[PDB]
Short mmCIF file of C-alpha atoms in Angstrom, two decimals:
data_model
loop_
_atom_site.label_atom_id
_atom_site.label_comp_id
_atom_site.label_asym_id
_atom_site.label_seq_id
_atom_site.Cartn_x
_atom_site.Cartn_y
_atom_site.Cartn_z
CA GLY V 1 29.07 -17.69 26.14
CA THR V 2 25.31 -17.60 25.52
CA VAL V 3 25.52 -19.09 22.00
CA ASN V 4 23.57 -22.18 20.88
CA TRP V 5 22.06 -23.10 24.23
CA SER V 6 19.48 -25.83 24.33
CA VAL V 7 15.91 -24.87 25.19
CA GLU V 8 16.31 -27.15 28.22
CA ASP V 9 19.28 -25.12 29.49
CA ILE V 10 17.38 -21.87 28.85
CA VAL V 11 14.46 -23.16 30.92
CA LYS V 12 16.83 -24.26 33.70
CA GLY V 13 18.42 -20.80 33.82
CA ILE V 14 15.16 -18.86 33.72
CA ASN V 15 13.64 -21.10 36.42
CA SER V 16 16.48 -20.50 38.84
CA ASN V 17 15.85 -17.44 40.90
CA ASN V 18 19.28 -15.99 40.38
CA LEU V 19 18.65 -12.78 38.47
CA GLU V 20 22.01 -13.03 36.69
CA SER V 21 21.36 -16.66 35.76
CA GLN V 22 17.98 -15.57 34.40
CA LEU V 23 19.59 -12.76 32.39
CA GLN V 24 22.15 -15.20 30.94
CA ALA V 25 19.44 -17.66 29.91
CA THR V 26 17.25 -14.87 28.50
CA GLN V 27 20.09 -13.61 26.32
CA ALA V 28 20.67 -17.20 25.19
CA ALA V 29 17.00 -17.38 24.20
CA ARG V 30 17.30 -14.05 22.37
CA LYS V 31 20.26 -15.35 20.37
CA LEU V 32 18.37 -18.55 19.57
CA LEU V 33 15.37 -16.51 18.38
CA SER V 34 17.49 -14.10 16.30
CA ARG V 35 19.08 -16.78 14.09
CA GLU V 36 18.11 -16.74 10.43
CA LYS V 37 17.54 -20.47 9.85
CA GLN V 38 14.27 -21.63 11.48
CA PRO V 39 14.35 -19.99 14.94
CA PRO V 40 12.66 -22.41 17.38
CA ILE V 41 9.78 -20.08 18.23
CA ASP V 42 7.31 -22.89 18.91
CA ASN V 43 9.79 -24.72 21.15
CA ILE V 44 10.26 -21.55 23.21
CA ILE V 45 6.48 -21.10 23.46
CA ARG V 46 5.87 -24.73 24.44
CA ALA V 47 8.49 -24.45 27.21
CA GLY V 48 6.26 -21.81 28.85
CA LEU V 49 8.82 -19.01 28.64
CA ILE V 50 6.54 -16.16 27.47
CA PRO V 51 5.10 -15.24 30.92
CA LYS V 52 8.64 -15.19 32.32
CA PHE V 53 9.86 -12.85 29.56
CA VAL V 54 6.82 -10.64 30.14
CA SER V 55 7.56 -10.41 33.86
CA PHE V 56 11.19 -9.59 33.01
CA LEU V 57 9.86 -6.62 31.02
CA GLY V 58 8.94 -5.03 34.36
CA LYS V 59 12.35 -5.41 36.07
CA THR V 60 13.23 -1.72 36.12
CA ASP V 61 16.25 -2.41 38.37
CA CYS V 62 17.98 -4.62 35.74
CA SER V 63 17.79 -2.91 32.34
CA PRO V 64 19.67 -5.70 30.45
CA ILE V 65 17.03 -8.35 31.18
CA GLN V 66 14.34 -5.88 30.11
CA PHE V 67 16.19 -5.47 26.81
CA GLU V 68 16.86 -9.18 26.24
CA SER V 69 13.31 -10.26 27.03
CA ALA V 70 11.91 -7.42 24.89
CA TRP V 71 14.05 -8.62 21.97
CA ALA V 72 13.06 -12.27 22.48
CA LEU V 73 9.37 -11.35 22.62
CA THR V 74 9.77 -9.11 19.57
CA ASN V 75 11.03 -12.06 17.58
CA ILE V 76 8.29 -14.38 18.86
CA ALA V 77 5.69 -11.74 17.91
CA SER V 78 7.22 -11.47 14.41
CA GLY V 79 6.01 -14.98 13.57
CA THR V 80 2.60 -16.43 12.77
CA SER V 81 -0.70 -15.07 14.06
CA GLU V 82 -0.71 -17.81 16.71
CA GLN V 83 2.79 -16.88 17.89
CA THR V 84 1.90 -13.19 18.09
CA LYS V 85 -1.26 -14.24 19.93
CA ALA V 86 0.84 -16.19 22.43
CA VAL V 87 2.81 -12.99 23.06
CA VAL V 88 -0.38 -10.94 23.51
CA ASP V 89 -1.96 -13.58 25.78
CA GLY V 90 1.02 -13.25 28.13
CA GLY V 91 0.12 -9.62 28.87
CA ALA V 92 2.93 -8.19 26.75
CA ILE V 93 1.02 -5.18 25.36
CA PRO V 94 0.77 -2.97 28.49
CA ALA V 95 4.30 -3.97 29.54
CA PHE V 96 5.75 -2.86 26.19
CA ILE V 97 3.73 0.36 26.36
CA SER V 98 5.28 0.90 29.79
CA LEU V 99 8.72 0.41 28.25
CA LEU V 100 8.07 3.08 25.60
CA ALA V 101 9.04 5.74 28.18
CA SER V 102 12.19 3.97 29.39
CA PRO V 103 15.33 6.14 29.77
CA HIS V 104 17.33 3.57 27.76
CA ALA V 105 16.82 4.29 24.07
CA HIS V 106 17.53 0.74 22.89
CA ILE V 107 14.87 -0.62 25.28
CA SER V 108 12.16 1.80 24.16
CA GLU V 109 13.12 1.17 20.53
CA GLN V 110 12.69 -2.56 21.18
CA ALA V 111 9.24 -1.89 22.66
CA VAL V 112 8.36 0.19 19.57
CA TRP V 113 9.41 -2.73 17.35
CA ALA V 114 7.44 -5.29 19.37
CA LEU V 115 4.28 -3.18 19.33
CA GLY V 116 4.79 -2.82 15.59
CA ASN V 117 4.78 -6.60 15.14
CA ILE V 118 1.73 -7.04 17.39
CA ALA V 119 -0.27 -4.29 15.68
CA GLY V 120 0.84 -5.57 12.28
CA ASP V 121 -0.86 -8.89 12.94
CA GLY V 122 -4.22 -7.38 12.00
CA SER V 123 -7.19 -5.18 12.84
CA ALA V 124 -8.04 -6.77 16.19
CA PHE V 125 -4.55 -6.62 17.69
CA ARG V 126 -4.00 -3.18 16.12
CA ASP V 127 -7.11 -1.84 17.86
CA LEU V 128 -6.15 -3.62 21.08
CA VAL V 129 -2.74 -1.93 21.02
CA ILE V 130 -4.58 1.36 20.50
CA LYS V 131 -7.02 0.69 23.38
CA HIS V 132 -4.09 0.04 25.75
CA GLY V 133 -2.98 3.63 24.99
CA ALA V 134 0.12 3.18 22.81
CA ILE V 135 -0.41 6.18 20.53
CA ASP V 136 0.33 8.93 23.07
CA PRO V 137 3.77 7.61 24.19
CA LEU V 138 4.67 6.65 20.61
CA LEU V 139 3.95 10.18 19.36
CA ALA V 140 5.68 11.65 22.41
CA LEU V 141 8.84 9.88 21.26
CA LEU V 142 8.66 12.05 18.10
CA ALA V 143 7.85 15.39 19.80
CA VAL V 144 11.22 16.97 19.06
CA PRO V 145 11.87 20.24 17.18
CA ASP V 146 13.98 18.53 14.47
CA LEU V 147 13.63 14.85 13.57
CA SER V 148 17.24 14.77 12.31
CA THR V 149 18.52 14.68 15.91
CA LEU V 150 16.97 11.24 16.45
CA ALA V 151 18.94 8.11 15.60
CA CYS V 152 18.12 6.88 12.11
CA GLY V 153 17.17 3.32 13.08
CA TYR V 154 15.04 4.59 15.96
CA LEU V 155 13.14 6.98 13.68
CA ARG V 156 12.66 4.29 11.02
CA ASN V 157 11.25 1.87 13.59
CA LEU V 158 8.83 4.47 14.98
CA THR V 159 7.66 5.31 11.45
CA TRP V 160 7.12 1.63 10.61
CA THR V 161 5.15 0.97 13.80
CA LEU V 162 2.95 4.03 13.17
CA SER V 163 2.32 2.79 9.63
CA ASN V 164 1.16 -0.53 11.08
CA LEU V 165 -1.19 1.36 13.38
CA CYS V 166 -2.52 2.91 10.18
CA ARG V 167 -2.81 -0.45 8.39
CA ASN V 168 -5.60 -2.96 7.66
CA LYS V 169 -9.36 -2.77 7.14
CA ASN V 170 -12.64 -4.37 8.25
CA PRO V 171 -12.53 -2.36 10.32
CA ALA V 172 -10.28 0.53 9.39
CA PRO V 173 -8.42 2.13 12.34
CA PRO V 174 -10.56 4.22 14.71
CA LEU V 175 -11.25 7.70 13.36
CA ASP V 176 -9.90 9.51 16.42
CA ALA V 177 -6.70 7.43 16.30
CA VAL V 178 -6.18 8.38 12.65
CA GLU V 179 -6.81 12.04 13.51
CA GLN V 180 -4.34 11.84 16.40
CA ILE V 181 -1.63 10.21 14.27
CA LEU V 182 -1.96 12.22 11.05
CA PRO V 183 -0.01 15.43 11.96
CA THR V 184 3.04 13.38 12.93
CA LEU V 185 2.64 11.43 9.69
CA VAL V 186 2.57 14.71 7.74
CA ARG V 187 5.80 15.79 9.41
CA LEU V 188 7.46 12.42 8.70
CA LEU V 189 6.41 12.74 5.04
CA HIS V 190 8.80 15.72 4.84
CA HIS V 191 11.78 13.95 6.44
CA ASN V 192 14.86 13.26 4.32
CA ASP V 193 15.43 9.55 5.02
CA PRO V 194 14.28 7.31 2.14
CA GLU V 195 13.00 4.53 4.44
CA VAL V 196 11.04 6.99 6.59
CA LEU V 197 9.57 8.47 3.40
CA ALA V 198 8.61 5.04 2.06
CA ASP V 199 6.92 3.96 5.30
CA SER V 200 5.13 7.32 5.65
CA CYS V 201 3.75 6.98 2.12
CA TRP V 202 2.69 3.45 3.01
CA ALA V 203 0.80 4.76 6.06
CA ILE V 204 -0.89 7.42 3.92
CA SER V 205 -1.79 4.82 1.29
CA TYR V 206 -3.45 2.71 3.98
CA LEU V 207 -5.37 5.71 5.30
CA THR V 208 -6.61 6.66 1.81
CA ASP V 209 -7.70 3.06 1.04
CA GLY V 210 -11.35 3.46 1.97
CA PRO V 211 -14.48 5.61 1.71
CA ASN V 212 -14.35 9.25 0.67
CA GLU V 213 -14.44 10.51 4.26
CA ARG V 214 -11.14 8.79 5.09
CA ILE V 215 -9.62 10.16 1.87
CA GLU V 216 -10.91 13.57 2.94
CA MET V 217 -9.25 13.33 6.36
CA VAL V 218 -5.96 12.79 4.56
CA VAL V 219 -6.48 15.33 1.76
CA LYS V 220 -7.45 18.13 4.18
CA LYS V 221 -3.99 17.91 5.80
CA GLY V 222 -2.51 19.28 2.56
CA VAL V 223 -0.21 16.32 1.83
CA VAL V 224 -1.16 15.87 -1.85
CA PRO V 225 1.60 18.18 -3.23
CA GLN V 226 4.21 16.35 -1.16
CA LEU V 227 2.79 13.06 -2.45
CA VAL V 228 3.22 14.32 -6.03
CA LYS V 229 6.81 15.35 -5.28
CA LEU V 230 7.52 11.88 -3.88
CA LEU V 231 5.79 10.43 -6.94
CA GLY V 232 8.65 11.98 -8.87
CA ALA V 233 11.32 10.33 -6.70
CA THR V 234 14.14 8.16 -8.02
CA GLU V 235 13.79 5.43 -5.36
CA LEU V 236 11.22 2.78 -6.30
CA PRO V 237 10.39 2.00 -2.61
CA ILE V 238 9.17 5.61 -2.40
CA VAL V 239 7.40 5.84 -5.77
CA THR V 240 5.41 2.65 -5.18
CA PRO V 241 3.53 3.76 -2.00
CA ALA V 242 3.29 7.35 -3.29
CA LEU V 243 1.59 6.11 -6.46
CA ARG V 244 -0.70 3.83 -4.44
CA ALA V 245 -1.73 6.79 -2.27
CA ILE V 246 -2.40 8.98 -5.31
CA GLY V 247 -4.51 6.26 -6.96
CA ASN V 248 -6.49 5.73 -3.76
CA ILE V 249 -7.13 9.48 -3.57
CA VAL V 250 -8.41 9.63 -7.16
CA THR V 251 -10.89 6.87 -6.35
CA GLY V 252 -12.75 9.54 -4.33
CA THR V 253 -14.82 12.55 -5.38
CA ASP V 254 -14.09 14.67 -8.43
CA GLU V 255 -12.91 17.46 -6.10
CA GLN V 256 -10.31 15.21 -4.43
CA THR V 257 -9.17 14.04 -7.88
CA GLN V 258 -8.96 17.71 -8.85
CA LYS V 259 -6.67 18.31 -5.88
CA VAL V 260 -4.41 15.60 -7.29
CA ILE V 261 -4.45 17.29 -10.71
CA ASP V 262 -3.79 20.81 -9.38
CA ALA V 263 -0.73 19.51 -7.52
CA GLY V 264 0.83 18.65 -10.89
CA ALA V 265 0.52 14.86 -10.87
CA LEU V 266 -0.28 14.42 -14.57
CA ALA V 267 3.16 15.74 -15.59
CA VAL V 268 4.70 12.65 -13.97
CA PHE V 269 2.67 10.16 -15.96
CA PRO V 270 4.76 10.07 -19.18
CA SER V 271 7.41 8.41 -17.01
CA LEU V 272 5.05 6.27 -14.91
CA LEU V 273 3.18 4.95 -17.94
CA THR V 274 6.49 3.81 -19.50
CA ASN V 275 8.16 2.75 -16.24
CA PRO V 276 10.14 -0.50 -16.65
CA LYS V 277 8.72 -1.96 -13.42
CA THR V 278 5.47 -3.69 -14.42
CA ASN V 279 3.61 -2.86 -11.20
CA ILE V 280 4.33 0.87 -11.55
CA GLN V 281 2.88 0.84 -15.07
CA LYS V 282 -0.17 -1.13 -13.93
CA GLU V 283 -0.95 1.16 -10.99
CA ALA V 284 -0.31 4.33 -13.01
CA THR V 285 -2.73 3.06 -15.65
CA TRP V 286 -5.33 2.23 -12.99
CA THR V 287 -4.91 5.75 -11.58
CA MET V 288 -5.37 7.17 -15.10
CA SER V 289 -8.52 5.05 -15.49
CA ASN V 290 -9.96 6.64 -12.37
CA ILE V 291 -9.01 10.09 -13.64
CA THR V 292 -10.72 9.55 -17.01
CA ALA V 293 -13.87 8.60 -15.09
CA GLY V 294 -14.04 12.21 -13.83
CA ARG V 295 -15.36 15.42 -15.31
CA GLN V 296 -14.90 16.53 -18.90
CA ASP V 297 -12.56 19.33 -17.78
CA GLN V 298 -10.45 16.68 -16.02
CA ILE V 299 -10.49 14.52 -19.16
CA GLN V 300 -9.39 17.69 -20.96
CA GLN V 301 -6.45 18.16 -18.61
CA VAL V 302 -5.50 14.55 -19.36
CA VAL V 303 -5.58 15.53 -23.04
CA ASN V 304 -3.53 18.72 -22.56
CA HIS V 305 -0.78 16.84 -20.71
CA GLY V 306 -0.33 14.66 -23.81
CA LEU V 307 -1.34 11.48 -21.96
CA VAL V 308 -3.66 9.96 -24.60
CA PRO V 309 -0.71 8.81 -26.77
CA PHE V 310 0.72 7.17 -23.64
CA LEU V 311 -2.60 5.39 -23.08
CA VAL V 312 -2.50 4.26 -26.72
CA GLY V 313 1.03 2.98 -26.12
CA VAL V 314 0.10 1.01 -23.01
CA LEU V 315 -2.90 -0.42 -24.88
CA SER V 316 -0.58 -1.43 -27.75
CA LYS V 317 2.16 -3.09 -25.69
CA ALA V 318 2.23 -3.83 -21.97
CA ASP V 319 1.73 -6.59 -19.45
CA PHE V 320 -1.81 -7.90 -19.86
CA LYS V 321 -3.04 -6.61 -16.49
CA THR V 322 -1.78 -3.15 -17.48
CA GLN V 323 -3.57 -3.50 -20.83
CA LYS V 324 -6.81 -4.30 -18.99
CA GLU V 325 -6.38 -1.16 -16.87
CA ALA V 326 -5.80 0.77 -20.11
CA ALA V 327 -9.00 -0.62 -21.62
CA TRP V 328 -10.82 0.55 -18.48
CA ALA V 329 -9.23 4.00 -18.86
CA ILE V 330 -10.42 4.17 -22.48
CA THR V 331 -14.00 3.12 -21.70
CA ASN V 332 -14.20 5.67 -18.87
CA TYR V 333 -12.84 8.33 -21.25
CA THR V 334 -15.38 7.49 -23.97
CA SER V 335 -18.31 7.32 -21.56
CA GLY V 336 -17.59 10.67 -19.94
CA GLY V 337 -15.95 12.66 -22.72
CA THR V 338 -17.27 15.18 -25.20
CA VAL V 339 -17.50 14.37 -28.90
CA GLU V 340 -14.32 16.29 -29.71
CA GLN V 341 -12.40 14.40 -27.01
CA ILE V 342 -13.54 11.04 -28.41
CA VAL V 343 -12.58 12.22 -31.91
CA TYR V 344 -9.14 13.16 -30.60
CA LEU V 345 -8.77 9.74 -28.98
CA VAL V 346 -9.51 8.09 -32.33
CA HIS V 347 -7.05 10.42 -34.08
CA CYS V 348 -4.32 9.32 -31.64
CA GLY V 349 -4.76 5.73 -32.87
CA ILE V 350 -6.85 3.94 -30.24
CA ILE V 351 -8.84 1.81 -32.70
CA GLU V 352 -6.24 -0.71 -33.86
CA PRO V 353 -4.85 -1.68 -30.41
CA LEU V 354 -8.41 -1.70 -29.05
CA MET V 355 -9.31 -4.18 -31.79
CA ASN V 356 -6.17 -6.28 -31.27
CA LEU V 357 -7.18 -6.74 -27.64
CA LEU V 358 -10.48 -8.30 -28.77
CA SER V 359 -8.61 -11.61 -29.24
CA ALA V 360 -8.07 -11.98 -25.49
CA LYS V 361 -9.33 -14.85 -23.33
CA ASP V 362 -10.72 -12.42 -20.71
CA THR V 363 -14.48 -11.87 -20.83
CA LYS V 364 -14.43 -8.65 -18.77
CA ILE V 365 -11.94 -6.90 -21.06
CA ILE V 366 -14.02 -7.93 -24.09
CA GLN V 367 -17.09 -6.33 -22.52
CA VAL V 368 -15.07 -3.21 -21.66
CA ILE V 369 -13.69 -2.82 -25.19
CA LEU V 370 -17.10 -3.38 -26.77
CA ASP V 371 -18.64 -0.68 -24.56
CA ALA V 372 -15.81 1.68 -25.52
CA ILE V 373 -16.35 1.05 -29.23
CA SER V 374 -20.10 1.61 -28.97
CA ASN V 375 -19.43 4.93 -27.23
CA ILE V 376 -17.08 5.90 -30.06
CA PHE V 377 -19.75 4.90 -32.58
CA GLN V 378 -22.30 7.08 -30.77
CA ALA V 379 -20.03 10.10 -31.10
CA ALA V 380 -19.48 9.23 -34.77
CA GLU V 381 -23.26 9.18 -35.21
CA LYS V 382 -23.43 12.71 -33.85
CA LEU V 383 -20.85 13.65 -36.48
CA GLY V 384 -22.38 11.52 -39.25
CA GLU V 385 -18.97 9.85 -39.68
CA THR V 386 -19.96 6.34 -38.59
CA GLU V 387 -19.03 4.39 -41.70
CA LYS V 388 -15.59 6.00 -41.87
CA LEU V 389 -15.16 4.50 -38.40
CA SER V 390 -16.56 1.16 -39.60
CA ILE V 391 -14.11 1.12 -42.52
CA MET V 392 -11.31 1.98 -40.09
CA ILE V 393 -12.41 -0.94 -37.90
CA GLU V 394 -12.62 -3.35 -40.84
CA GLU V 395 -9.26 -2.43 -42.41
CA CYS V 396 -7.37 -3.30 -39.20
CA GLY V 397 -9.16 -6.64 -38.77
CA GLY V 398 -11.67 -5.46 -36.18
CA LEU V 399 -14.83 -6.58 -37.97
CA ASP V 400 -13.55 -10.17 -38.16
CA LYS V 401 -13.06 -10.32 -34.40
CA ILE V 402 -16.36 -8.59 -33.58
CA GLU V 403 -18.23 -10.96 -35.91
CA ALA V 404 -16.48 -13.98 -34.39
CA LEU V 405 -17.57 -12.71 -30.96
CA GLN V 406 -21.17 -13.37 -32.03
CA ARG V 407 -20.49 -17.10 -31.51
CA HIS V 408 -19.22 -16.58 -27.97
CA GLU V 409 -20.04 -18.23 -24.65
CA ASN V 410 -20.95 -15.12 -22.67
CA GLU V 411 -24.43 -13.78 -23.40
CA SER V 412 -23.56 -10.11 -22.94
CA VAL V 413 -20.59 -10.43 -25.33
CA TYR V 414 -22.73 -12.00 -28.06
CA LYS V 415 -25.49 -9.43 -27.48
CA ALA V 416 -23.18 -6.41 -27.78
CA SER V 417 -21.37 -7.84 -30.83
CA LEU V 418 -24.63 -8.64 -32.63
CA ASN V 419 -25.91 -5.15 -31.78
CA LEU V 420 -22.75 -3.60 -33.22
CA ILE V 421 -22.88 -5.45 -36.55
CA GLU V 422 -26.63 -4.96 -36.86
CA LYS V 423 -26.30 -1.20 -36.29
CA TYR V 424 -23.06 -0.47 -38.17
CA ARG I 1 6.17 -6.59 5.28
CA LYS I 2 3.69 -6.65 8.16
CA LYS I 3 6.10 -8.13 10.73
CA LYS I 4 9.86 -7.84 11.17
CA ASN I 5 12.28 -10.24 12.83
CA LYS I 6 15.19 -8.49 14.58
CA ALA I 7 18.39 -10.31 13.63
#
């Protein structure tokens, strides 16, 4: 019926002023735009159809053409920044916001989806969607006593669009918009649907990706324990954003990091630091590195949870990016820790994998490892046990690599290596 | 990721 029309026929139908002819042609355009292989978005745009679709959005008396034009515009807005811009330039934003309160659930869901695509383009369109007043009707769609009474696809789409309103930086979303959205986010973070949980954690991870005041806005809502619980989940699409949120949070103050620790997060890290998905291991090790940059009592809680052997393991064998994060974790540990904590780290076996990493072609990791070793040597000086450490370094091949690093391109590398062999 | 086509 309306399958595989030409763009020319679609234009002919839309440019009649027979409402039914226009609806037929609009559905034909929707079907064209919802095909998987190269939908002709740019042909539709060049034919001048966007203003006609936008005007169809306002035809309250004919709900089907509202739906079909909303779907067509959704798919146009899902494309490149220029295609989304063409949708915005046609005045689509206020018309979609108007459709949010439509009595037909599929139409308001379509408007939710379209606003999600538009806001997901970036900071400017996100803030423009916000300025047109989308947040109030979006949140009103979720003001029900139990979220389980909403249709699952509807709820997932609302969660995804809210996460896009929470997304992107330079600038971050407006503070009052974040404050307005957060309670609904907290409630969605306790819903039972895995996709809703994943997208809620994504929103929270966006909101915690910034300065300590943003992190504090999130942390004050009390979501950290629920984030830890989701960190323990079996579904990788949930664990990934949960772990990103937790790592973002521990980039903040020592008190925010302490909130992460009190919630029980460290007990999950034996799994995370051996997780078979490389990115999980990398981000867990980065999170650990930001925890070992904290207070000595926090370093001590890392010790008590048995996590130093897991750091040794990741340093010994992992993807190289994960190994670099582990080297960072070790240098933070050795710079902030007491003498007994550094002794314990040596007794767990850090020295040999630390040395083995000194044969890497990465200048930053060489600097990091050299700083770590000098910190360890300083603690050994306090204990008068420095040459036992030097013999330990030489028996595993460390002295050879440190001495070779004297004839190295980077000036800081050569300086630190020469200092080490001159002193010890 | 950021945008979603409705098929």
